[PDB]
């Protein structure tokens, strides 16, 4: 790779390495409960062995219908360790949408919990249902499994909206992001990282593995904490959280003077205004992160430090091992200042859309610039600036 990363390693392999180096460090926090890296890893291994016994294997797609919680993360890690990929199904989606995802994904096994069992019943799911807080796992072996794995194996299928489509992401993209987070944000095991997004929104993937592939601690925010801006600020300050990713629409309601310990604020998913950036960029490192679900994150713009106010907010430059092409309708490259479609190549590109071969071929085209690879057509309008940053301009 152009930029070094842990090539050849799976997500759970990278997590296991952190658990070996930082066994007694806090890995995950939810309300009054927490687990160390060693405890989290052992519990994930016990559940992974149960999942293997039930038949989970390479490119098994496993539904997860759970409340955000420590146990939710145990389940994700266990699916990966068993060799499968997870499909997160937010339990607050409407019943019609849950049923569509279950049917489209063709998953034969759904991981849930006692408080969600009735919803699994009421959506009519006829596959295998594992109620995790009814399974007896404590007696199972806790060592790592070392199942066969390749970086090109599926890691997760996340649905977006035509009809919702299951976007298929492999391990390699997240391995590259481990290296990106450590190089570009300087993430270390000392960091304390909040988890804000729904597990059905791929921001949550970034947040979870930003912590757990670096030895840092992951603080899963409760619904009560998110629902009250003052409670959110108090939680971040009392727990001395150092990194958080937010929608700009949430950030606009927060008070910088009430957050004590953040060193990085990332916004993602929509544009931040220049006045919002100006309000935060001198209190901490403000980062605008852009990307489609089809590659998680594609570009970032960190507001340059110790500079006067900005009047606009670029989406920045491609992250490591990722390439941006701004092209016309004939996929020809445009010069600086010309508006065109933002297209993406790189190690984090999705495999495509689950059981949508024509749509996949339409959106993941042959990369004209790198023979043998694919390039994703985002439908986003953009242009280059002469300083080499990109301006997001809306939809084509």
Residues that bind ligand 8Q2 (CB under 6 A): 160, 202-203, 206, 245, 266, 268-271, 288-293, 296-297, 315, 378, 380, 392
Q: Which residue, 125 or 180, is less far from ligand 8Q2 as judged by CB?
A: 180
CB of 196: closest distance to ligand 8Q2 in angstroms? 11
Q: Minimum distance between the CB of residue 257 and ligand 8Q2, rounded to whole angstroms?
A: 25
Q: How far is the CB of 155 from ligand 8Q2 (least distance, A)?
A: 15
Question: 5 or 290: whose CB is closer to ligand 8Q2?
Answer: 290
CA angle 207, 57, 111 (to 5 degrees): 55
DSSP 175-215: HHHHHHIIIII---TT-EEEE-S-TTSTHHHHHHHHHHTTT
Q: Following DSSP, what letter does each residue of 221-275 receive, concatenated?
A: --HHHHH-HHHHHHHHHHTT--EEEE-HHHHTT--GGG--S-SEEEEESSPPPHH
Residue number with CB closer to ligand 8Q2 (50 or 210): 210
Residue 139 class from Cβ within 10 Å (0-12 exposed, 13-18 middle, 19+ buried)? exposed
Nearer to ligand 8Q2, 120 or 195 (CB): 195
> What are the φ/ψ torsions at residue 293 (nearest 5 degrees)?
-55, -25
Closer residue to ligand 8Q2, CB minimum distance, 83 or 340? 340
Angle at 18 between CA 12 and CA 24, to 5 degrees: 125
CA distance 85 to 60: 6
| Nearest to ligand 8Q2 of 14, 82 (CB atom) | 14
Shortest Cβ 21–ligand 8Q2 spacing (Å): 23
Strands 33-36 and 61-64: unpaired
The least distance separating ligand 8Q2 from the CB of residue 28, rounded to whole angstroms, comes to 19
Bridge partners of residue 131, in order along the sequence = 112
Least distance to ligand 8Q2, CB of residue 301, Å:
8
Measured from the CB atom, the residue of 280 and 392 that comes closer to ligand 8Q2 is 392
- Going by C-beta distance under 8 Å and a sequence separation of 6 or more, which residues neighbour residue 8? 151
Q: How far is the CB of 288 from ligand 8Q2 (least distance, A)?
A: 5
Task: Return the structure tokens found at 10.
Answer: 């799976």
Considering only CA atoms, which of 159, 241, 153, 154 is closest in space to residue 199?
Answer: 159
Q: Among all chains, which residue has been given the structure tokens 């713009």?
A: 301
Least CB distance from residue 194 to ligand 8Q2, whole Å?
Answer: 13
Q: Which is nearer to ligand 8Q2, 79 or 244 (CB)?
A: 244
Cα–Cα distance for residue pair 376/370, rounded to 1 Å? 13
C-beta of 38 vs 160, nearer to ligand 8Q2: 160
Residue 290 CB, nearest approach to ligand 8Q2 (Å) = 4
Contact 132, 112 (CB under 8 A): yes
């Amino acid at each position: 790779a152009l930029v070094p990363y842990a090539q050849g390693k799976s997500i759970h392999q990278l997590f296991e390495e952190q658990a070996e180096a930082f066994p007694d460090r806090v890995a995950i926090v939810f309300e009054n409960r927490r687990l160390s890296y060693q405890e989290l890893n052992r519990k994930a291994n016990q559940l992974a062995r149960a999942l293997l016994e039930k038949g989970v294997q390479t490119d098994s797609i496993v539904g997860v219908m759970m409340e955000k919680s420590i146990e939710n993360v145990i389940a994700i890690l266990a699916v990966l360790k068993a060799g499968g990929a997870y499909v997160p199904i937010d339990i607050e989606y409407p019943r019609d949408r849950i049923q569509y995802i279950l049917q489209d994904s063709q998953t034969k096994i759904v991981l849930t919990q006692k408080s969600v069992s009735q919803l699994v019943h009421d959506v009519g799911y006829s596959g295998e249902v594992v109620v995790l807080d009814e399974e007896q796992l404590d007696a199972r072996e806790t060592a790592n499994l070392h199942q066969p794995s390749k970086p090109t194996d599926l890691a997760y299928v996340i649905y977006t909206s035509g009809k919702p489509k299951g976007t298929m992401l492999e391990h390699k993209g997240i391995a590259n992001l481990q290296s990106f987070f450590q190089n570009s944000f300087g993430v270390t095991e000392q960091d304390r990282i909040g988890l804000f997004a729904s597990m059905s929104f791929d921001v949550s993937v970034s947040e979870m593995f930003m912590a757990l592939l670096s030895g840092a601690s992951l603080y899963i925010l409760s619904k009560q904490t998110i629902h009250d801006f003052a409670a959110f600020e108090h939680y971040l300050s009392e727990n001395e959280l150092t990194i958080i990713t937010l929608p700009p629409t949430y950030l606009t309601h927060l008070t910088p003077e009430r957050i004590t310990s953040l060193r990085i604020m990332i916004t993602a998913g929509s544009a931040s205004s220049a006045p919002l950036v100006n309000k935060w960029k001198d209190k901490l490192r403000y980062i605008n992160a852009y990307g489609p679900t089809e590659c998680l994150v594609a570009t970032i713009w960190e507001a340059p430090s110790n500079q006067l106010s900005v009047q606009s907010v670029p989406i920045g430059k491609p992250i490591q091992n990722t390439h941006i092409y701004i092209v016309n309708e004939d996929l020809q490259l445009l010069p600086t200042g010309s508006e065109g479609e933002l297209c993406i190549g790189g190690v984090g590109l999705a495999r495509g859309y689950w059981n949508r071969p024509d749509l996949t071929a339409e959106k993941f085209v042959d990369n004209p610039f790198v023979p043998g690879e694919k390039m994703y057509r985002t439908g986003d309008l953009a242009k280059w600036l002469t300083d080499g940053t990109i301006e997001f301009l809306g939809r084509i």
